[PDB]
Enzyme design. Structure first.
Site, mmCIF file in Angstrom:
data_model
loop_
_atom_site.group_PDB
_atom_site.id
_atom_site.type_symbol
_atom_site.label_atom_id
_atom_site.label_comp_id
_atom_site.label_asym_id
_atom_site.label_seq_id
_atom_site.Cartn_x
_atom_site.Cartn_y
_atom_site.Cartn_z
ATOM 1 N N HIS A 99 8.438 -3.030 4.394
ATOM 2 C CA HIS A 99 7.157 -2.068 4.645
ATOM 3 C C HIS A 99 5.971 -2.298 3.942
ATOM 4 O O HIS A 99 5.972 -3.004 2.871
ATOM 5 C CB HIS A 99 7.774 -0.444 4.244
ATOM 6 N N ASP A 123 3.461 0.103 3.619
ATOM 7 C CA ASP A 123 2.764 1.231 3.228
ATOM 8 C C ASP A 123 3.122 1.133 1.359
ATOM 9 O O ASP A 123 4.324 0.785 1.397
ATOM 10 C CB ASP A 123 3.131 2.545 3.890
ATOM 11 N N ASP A 142 6.489 -3.301 -4.582
ATOM 12 C CA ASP A 142 7.163 -2.334 -3.681
ATOM 13 C C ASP A 142 5.897 -1.967 -2.639
ATOM 14 O O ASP A 142 5.412 -1.057 -2.551
ATOM 15 C CB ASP A 142 7.339 -1.240 -4.421
ATOM 16 N N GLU A 177 7.446 3.942 4.873
ATOM 17 C CA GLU A 177 8.726 3.813 4.195
ATOM 18 C C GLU A 177 8.781 4.958 3.260
ATOM 19 O O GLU A 177 9.627 5.712 2.847
ATOM 20 C CB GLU A 177 9.009 2.552 3.638
ATOM 21 N N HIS A 202 6.409 2.522 -8.215
ATOM 22 C CA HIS A 202 5.982 4.084 -7.847
ATOM 23 C C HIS A 202 5.645 4.709 -9.131
ATOM 24 O O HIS A 202 5.750 5.945 -9.581
ATOM 25 C CB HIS A 202 7.349 4.872 -7.710
HETATM 26 ZN ZN ZN Z 1 9.753 0.032 -0.615
HETATM 27 ZN ZN ZN Z 2 8.834 2.892 -2.514
#
Ligand code: ZN
Ligand code: ZN
Length: 471
Positions: free
Chosen positions: A101, A103, A134, A168, A443
């Site tokens: 992903h 995003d 990520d 995602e 995150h």
């Molecule tokens: Zn991810």
């Molecule tokens: Zn993530």
């Protein structure tokens, strides 16, 4: 020493590493934030998918960017296209599919970033930026591996398919229906599926199990308008007082969850299982150090890992609707929403957990004799996922890891949830190859991927292509 002209592929990767790192810098600078319903960001997400579609085409792939339609918010937003790409359809070859992903989670510099989140900054071999681990780093590591065989006019050992989405971080809106539509079309004859969106714990890893999740929102409402905390202080059942009591009723100081019924269906710990944990390689002083945590809830490697992988856990995330900015506002919030989730493990039932948490909260709230209204809603509920270790996809990965890192991977579980793993299992009927380090900070503020992980991981993927061809 590597095999073959994997030697040449490996040489290429080492010579082009600064170029690989500059491409990542360029992909990270595209602010592909899917979580903010803000046209500025959703446009940047579409540009990201377009940059990736072009990258794959230039590599030699047949690329389709699939129109996904609107995201219902009473307003809406366009969903970014899903890339469905194929590199080779050689009938004398097996076929491997990669999911990623492009995003990212929101990043505001004011959140506590020491760097500009969207300017990839290298500091002591660490590449800092939102999406570095990520998931732009590992997507590019995979793409860069392919681009090494392509640049050198070396035959790729397997056909390669790519499925790359841009939603995602916002629940993969519309992905499942596309997957379902494609189960016997694009996924017809795909042998194995790879995901690289997870972290090591110490020793490289292969990940074969994940936890489920249940996300709860607890609304306590008086009226919509807030009150001056002095003009109205002393005479209300305050939404914040109710919510804090609700949230405080969930877990104790030892991490033990207080919702009745929650442990009923957790599988019993066995001798066999304990042994599996004893065989994992984790220095607990090293882990405390990279996490910058004084002490954990537990003293031993085995307890730590089990509480991450095979025991449920409860985390309170925050409160919406109250005073959450810096300073000293004197306000009684009229309507507040507590957020928390429970990670699920075998053999917990989502519907039972939903019932138990709700009943618990109702019982706590009713004892307060409050005039407020409470609404509990479980907004997200996913079962845990487990792969069969020693599957053919799993063996190829083990061998590829041994080749690149010169050591055996530990077979690890993961405390997080990879909903996509479950989805490919339910609809298409997956191997998780982590490239991230334990301290990558996905995150969070000051997310990074290590240059070594990004570059050596490119080699891992190169070796892996070859291993998949070998069965
Ligand atoms: Zn991810
Ligand atoms: Zn993530």
């Amino acid at each position: 020493p590597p095999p073959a002209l994997l030697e040449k592929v490996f040489q290429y990767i080492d010579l082009h590493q600064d170029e690989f790192v500059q491409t990542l810098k360029e992909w990270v600078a595209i602010e592909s934030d899917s979580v903010q319903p803000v046209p500025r960001f959703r446009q940047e997400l579409f540009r990201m998918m377009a940059v990736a579609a072009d990258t794959l085409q230039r590599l030699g792939a047949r690329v389709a960017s699939v129109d996904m339609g609107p995201q219902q918010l009473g307003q809406s937003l366009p969903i970014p296209p899903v890339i469905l790409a194929e590199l080779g359809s050689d009938p004398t070859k097996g076929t491997v599919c990669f999911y990623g992903h492009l995003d990212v989670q929101p990043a505001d510099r004011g959140d506590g970033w020491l760097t500009d989140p969207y300017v990839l900054t290298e500091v002591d071999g660490k590449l800092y930026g939102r999406g570095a681990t990520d998931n732009k780093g590992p997507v590019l590591a995979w793409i860069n591996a392919v681009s090494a065989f392509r640049a050198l006019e070396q035959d790729l050992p397997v056909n390669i398919k790519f499925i790359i989405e841009g939603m995602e971080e916002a629940g993969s809106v519309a992905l499942e229906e596309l997957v379902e539509k494609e189960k016997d079309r694009f996924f017809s004859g795909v042998d194995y599926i790879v995901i690289s969106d997870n972290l090591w714990i110490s020793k490289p890893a292969i990940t074969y199990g994940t936890r489920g999740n249940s996300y709860f929102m607890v609304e306590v409402k008086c009226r919509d308008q807030d009150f001056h905390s002095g003009t109205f202080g002393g005479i209300l059942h305050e939404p914040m007082a109710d919510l804090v009591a609700l949230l405080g009723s969930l877990v104790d100081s030892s991490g033990h969850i207080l919702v009745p019924g929650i442990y009923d269906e957790v599988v019993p710990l066995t001798e066999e299982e304990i042994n599996t944990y004893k065989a994992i390689h984790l220095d607990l002083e090293e882990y405390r150090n990279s996490s910058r945590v004084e002490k954990f809830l537990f003293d031993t490697k085995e307890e730590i890992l089990m509480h991450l992988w095979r025991y449920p856990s409860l985390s309170i995330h925050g409160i919406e609707g109250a005073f959450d900015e810096p300073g000293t506002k004197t306000v009684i919030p009229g309507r507040v929403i507590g957020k928390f989730s429970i990670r699920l493990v075998p053999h917990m039932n989502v519907s039972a957990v939903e019932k138990q948490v709700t009943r618990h909260l109702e019982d706590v709230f009713s004892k307060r004799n409050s005039s407020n209204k409470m609404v509990v809603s479980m907004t997200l509920g996913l079962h845990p996922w487990i792969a069969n270790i020693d599957d053919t996809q799993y063996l190829a990965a083990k061998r590829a890891i041994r080749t690149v890192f010169g050591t055996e991977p530990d077979m690890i579980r993961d405390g997080s949830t990879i909903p996509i793993a479950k989805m490919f299992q339910e609809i298409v009927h997956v191997v998780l190859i982590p490239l991230g380090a334990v301290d990558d900070g996905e995150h969070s503020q000051n997310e990074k991927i290590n240059r070594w992980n990004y570059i050596e991981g490119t080699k891992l993927f190169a070796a892996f292509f070859l291993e998949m061809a070998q069965l």
